[PDB]
Design a binder for these strands. Sequence first.
RNA 1: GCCCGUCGCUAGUACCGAUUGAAUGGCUUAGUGAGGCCUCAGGAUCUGCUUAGAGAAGGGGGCAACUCCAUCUCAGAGCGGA
RNA 2: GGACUUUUACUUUGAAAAAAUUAGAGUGUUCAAAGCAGGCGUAUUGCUCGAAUAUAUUAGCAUGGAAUAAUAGAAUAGGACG
RNA 3: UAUCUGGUUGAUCCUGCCAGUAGUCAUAUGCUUGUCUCAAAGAUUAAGCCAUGCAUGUCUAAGUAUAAGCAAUUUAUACAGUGAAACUGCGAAUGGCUCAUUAAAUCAGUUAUCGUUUAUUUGAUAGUUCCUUUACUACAUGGUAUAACUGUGGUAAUUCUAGAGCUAAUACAUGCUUAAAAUCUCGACCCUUUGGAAGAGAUGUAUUUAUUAGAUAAAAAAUCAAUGUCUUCGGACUCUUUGAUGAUUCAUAAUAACUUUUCGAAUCGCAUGGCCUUGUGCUGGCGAUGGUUCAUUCAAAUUUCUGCCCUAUCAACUUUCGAUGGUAGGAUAGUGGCCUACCAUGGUUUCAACGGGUAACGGGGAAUAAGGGUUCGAUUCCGGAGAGGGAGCCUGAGAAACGGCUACCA
Lengths: 155, 167, 260, 188, 131
Amino acid sequence: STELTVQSERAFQKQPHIFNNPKVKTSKRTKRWYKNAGLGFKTPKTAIEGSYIDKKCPFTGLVSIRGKILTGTVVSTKMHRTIVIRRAYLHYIPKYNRYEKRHKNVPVHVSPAFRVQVGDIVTVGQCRPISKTVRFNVVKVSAAXXXXXXXXXXX
Amino acid sequence: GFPMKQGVLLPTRIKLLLTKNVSCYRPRRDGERKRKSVRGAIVGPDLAVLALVIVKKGEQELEGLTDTTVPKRLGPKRANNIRKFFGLSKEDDVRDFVIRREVTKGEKTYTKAPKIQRLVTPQRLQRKRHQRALKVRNAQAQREAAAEYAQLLAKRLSERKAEKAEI
Amino acid sequence: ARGPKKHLKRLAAPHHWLLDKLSGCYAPRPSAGPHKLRESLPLIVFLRNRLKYALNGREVKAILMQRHVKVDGKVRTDTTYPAGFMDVITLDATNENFRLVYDVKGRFAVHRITDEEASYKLGKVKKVQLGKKGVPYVVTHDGRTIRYPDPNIKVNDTVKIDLASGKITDFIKFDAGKLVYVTGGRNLGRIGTIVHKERHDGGFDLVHIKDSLDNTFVTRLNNVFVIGEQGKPYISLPKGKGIKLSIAEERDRRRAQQGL
Amino acid sequence: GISRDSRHKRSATGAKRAQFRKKRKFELGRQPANTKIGAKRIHSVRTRGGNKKYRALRIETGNFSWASEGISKKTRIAGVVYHPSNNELVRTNTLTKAAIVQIDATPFRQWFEAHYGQTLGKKSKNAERKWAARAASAKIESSVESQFSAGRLYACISSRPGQSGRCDGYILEGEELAFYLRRLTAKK
Amino acid sequence: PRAPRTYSKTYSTPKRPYESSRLDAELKLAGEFGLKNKKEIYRISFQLSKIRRAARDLLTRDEKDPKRLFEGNALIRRLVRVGVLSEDKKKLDYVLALKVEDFLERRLQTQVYKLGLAKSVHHARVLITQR
RNA sequence: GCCCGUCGCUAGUACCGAUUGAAUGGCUUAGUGAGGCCUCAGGAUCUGCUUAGAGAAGGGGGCAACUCCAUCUCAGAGCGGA
RNA sequence: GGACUUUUACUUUGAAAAAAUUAGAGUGUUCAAAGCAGGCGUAUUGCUCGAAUAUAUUAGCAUGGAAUAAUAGAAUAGGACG
RNA sequence: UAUCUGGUUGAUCCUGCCAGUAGUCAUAUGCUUGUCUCAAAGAUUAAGCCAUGCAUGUCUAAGUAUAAGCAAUUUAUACAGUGAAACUGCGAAUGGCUCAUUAAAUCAGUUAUCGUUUAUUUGAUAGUUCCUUUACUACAUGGUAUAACUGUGGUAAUUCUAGAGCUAAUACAUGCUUAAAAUCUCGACCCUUUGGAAGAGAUGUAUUUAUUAGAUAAAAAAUCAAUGUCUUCGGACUCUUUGAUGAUUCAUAAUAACUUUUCGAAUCGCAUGGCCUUGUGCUGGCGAUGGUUCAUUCAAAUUUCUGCCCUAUCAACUUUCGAUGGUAGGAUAGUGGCCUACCAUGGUUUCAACGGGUAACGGGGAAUAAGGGUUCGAUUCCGGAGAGGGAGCCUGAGAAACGGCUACCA
């Protein structure tokens, strides 16, 4: 999430060790570090172009995408740099031989490299514990805004 | 029967938490502490026995004390402990100056001596020399092996330039 | 649960050991060492349950204490020594030389080898990793760590060792078409030349295999051990060479040799 | 003692949790050293599986690096003036990581004046050779030189004195020095 | 903490207890083969029942199926070896046929009578059980 | 013919109920708060480093000037450790 | 190795899959419940077969299918390719 | 192995229950009980209470024997046989026992550590340790301080122990050492050139910080400040080395440093010779214990995905005194609201949250045989939890242990 300010905390926001020297005259100002999480998840343009800091950012931070890779629908975007997605599914009951509707709300960290809203079907990858309820990180916004501009007005 | 304990003060009895290697408590398990009663270090009337030490001689002899004498049961067993028990200076062959004890085996008279530890012996020097020798030997060993891997990669690069020139 | 599990309840003990259900409440806990617990074979099970050279484990311990056994060189007086796959058991008395290896029933076979063949070992590398002071090292499956190997060697590449000393000789790379011994699964004991390695990034690489009978099976890049070229292994395979006879064919062969 | 499990606490759903099992030693937590300044006193804690941490309480000298000079000098630390977690760690001059101190600014002088012959603020042959060789690389920076004048250099602690027993940090520079400057004089 | 010395029973037991006809038949079997308890009928008919069970289980499988192959002809070898199943009618449809009589008339009890050595099935019993 | 309810007898069960009734169990405020653990101090005693007096030992090797290593003892000054 | 990809349910084969249990093959514990034994000569100096197979259903993985049934797409063209 | 039968009516056909009928690794109780094999067994209620005994100790040629110990004999005047006690080392954290608590916990199948610790075993792994450094520092090996023991003792009373006299170490505490090499620095002098040089300092490993190398997406050029190697003196600069991963700030390496300095052998048993410069000079055999880092193994800890019985006469629940998240620290072996400080207002919910219940440990499993189901699982295998309740903690690789201690309640 973030937006603006970037340096907006009591402690300086700097990526670890990524040093740039004031003696060294520069046009880039601050030297930047990035990578790719693997699993064919193309490290998004806005992650390298970006100006934020997020040490929980999978592409420009100090975490690692590994384990399960899941997808789900976005039901919540309120908490700063973290959202809540709802994976639905059907559970097979043999006695009646029928599948019953069920769901789970996974809390997932979302880097300021994305522009997530409620609805955008999204793809996240498991990581380390980053919080009390966070074990995943958004790694591909599959949807968009669900034909939102399509609902407009007249002329 | 409770014991005193230097540096607890009080002419009373206090229950203290005792640990390893400290008066009035010998532990019974690895790091096993125990809270036991103890008597203060301040002499009172409640005492049955008082442990005293003669520090300066009087003007009269004391029966089972000053008068009679009794020897330290043992003698020096380590090397320099002997040498410096007699003040011999490091040379005077410490394999003689060790006290030997006569015990009589009825109609056999036995002379038993300790066992001088920390003595410099032919076998210990043999060992030390073996240590240095082994260390240096494996040192040069690993150096040469390092050189041989270096040459392996060398005439690996050689086949690199050879095959890359081939095309 | 408070510390190291020092016992072994005889019912938990790996089935390929072949121990009898009744008569006993415990089994030889494999000691720590080169082989994983449930893919090892205690020298007490070997010098007794397979070699019948003993009865009481006490006799086993006595035998071992008289140095009359040695694994890949060193004597080994650990009654429950965790010996296992590709290892070499030497008996100077009896003049017997054994290689611990899988049949096709995925058990452990009483395999006798030459005294000559009993001085080299196959060893799948588990890691080609750089070490301290620059020294590169390969660590093969049997805990063996050998420094200064070959930049042509990568992970899962098998290896022939001097045993007598600790040096790698000719190494067999992991390519399509290399004679492969299966170490784990219910396709273990089998052998079959490699067909094709299903990749799957960070998700257990499947290994497609076809033996010498035109039969095919898959496994994973874990249970797969390389041992040569088609028809051309590097060690002495046992009587069956991992072809896995079906049940009816087994009914046939064991009743094929019928006339007394 | 302090027990860093998650087994207490509420679940994210809000429900209160029962008590399965008792406090386990392997999930312990020990007290914050609350390291102070002055006269080295360091007590070692026996951590898990052998291994020691060196809980430091009172520390007067630390090894501080100058990022754009490739050097590190063991200097005398002189109090905290800023800390992003709490101001108590500043009023108390408590030494923690990420803390901002002012250091001796005299070994860095004696080094810099013996490496450039330029001397902050405001004769040998080989020496002059080396100096002429250098220079064209000694503009320092307004803030670091101004820092030098007073004889106290803003540094930022980077080691963990509770853990390591070390009080190492780095001289501030660039946008970071700028940030802490701003943030510092503004709150006076 | 040991291994369990496992077990099973060897007899099933009639649903209806007082069906006259089956009491007739079972009693006949008793006075024909010199049996003791009505348990030696139940047991045998239960063994047989498990056999028939496996049989009709296989029958549903495709013919020349792996399991039908191996286990079918295995059970066939089985029922032939003792002399319950005929070498003539030797293909598992006849094990689905079968009858308890074929098990009854194969006992050592019975065969020590079938060619003399007895004159009566009871003398067979006694002589067998007496070493 | 069947048959309903009040009323009367015996037995059993459950309910309402003054007692703001009573009992076991789990949580929990407030107050008091043992114990070990960390921590500021403490310093029975008990060694130790550095600055030196008053007697001997052991010699870097000299005709007189000159000078190194380990060890033991007390009237007497600083830097700390258990 | 660079560069991008509408998401599913379903089914298939397979991998991963402790043993005891269970279904079940062989072996006459004299029979049976069991046990995993055992069977052979040269029974005065070994010969030898075994200790199988199956189920292991939901979920995760791997794969073959493309019907059935959902899903997303270009209408203010803010479309498609070049 | 797909079976019904008796009871409502005068009689009938229904609905429907009742009763019969068969099993039960399912308890009990009653009557009778001869033979072989197999042998479960204070779970249910009272994880209620316990007399007494016993259940964890342990020695190799190879850490310590002056027993005033027993025995000798082959020697063995330092010790050498064997060996109580005591030190030291390791173990006592496994095993056994119970099922109380426990319902998204445990457990299960499936995962993750690019999120950590790990005695051991196994395979590797150490030439630097002193210091203005010719009149040198024990390394032919530096310091004591204790038990056992002797001796004087205290208490009604315990595996209670006090004062004194001795003495060991692979215990306690110290502390020398080894070749070459080149690299990074300082540089006395000489001489201005285009510039070089004596010999002085630093460079084991570990520690903590900061910086750097760790290329590789197909191919070329100009310039600035540094500045390397060979002179064919306008200058070129060609051969120029590159690990792993799906993925890293990974392995690995460099510089500048820092440390009440990690480790780098003052250890033990058998043998006892090789070679002369005959010095009690100098080397040397096999294997034991130890010793830092890496791997390995036995492990451990958290961890992803899906799965629980009854309950709405429980509908809202979570933020008190963390509830959901961001930042920073602190703490951990390490991830993390694990904790603190600031900040935000979030998190679960009829697809049933939260709460209550459970005479609920979970699973492998078990009983009942058309099928679908139903019921059960304290209990021999795995995983968890506890040792009357609670908390606290010592020791240690590993315990919040209980045949450990400490405190409180009973």
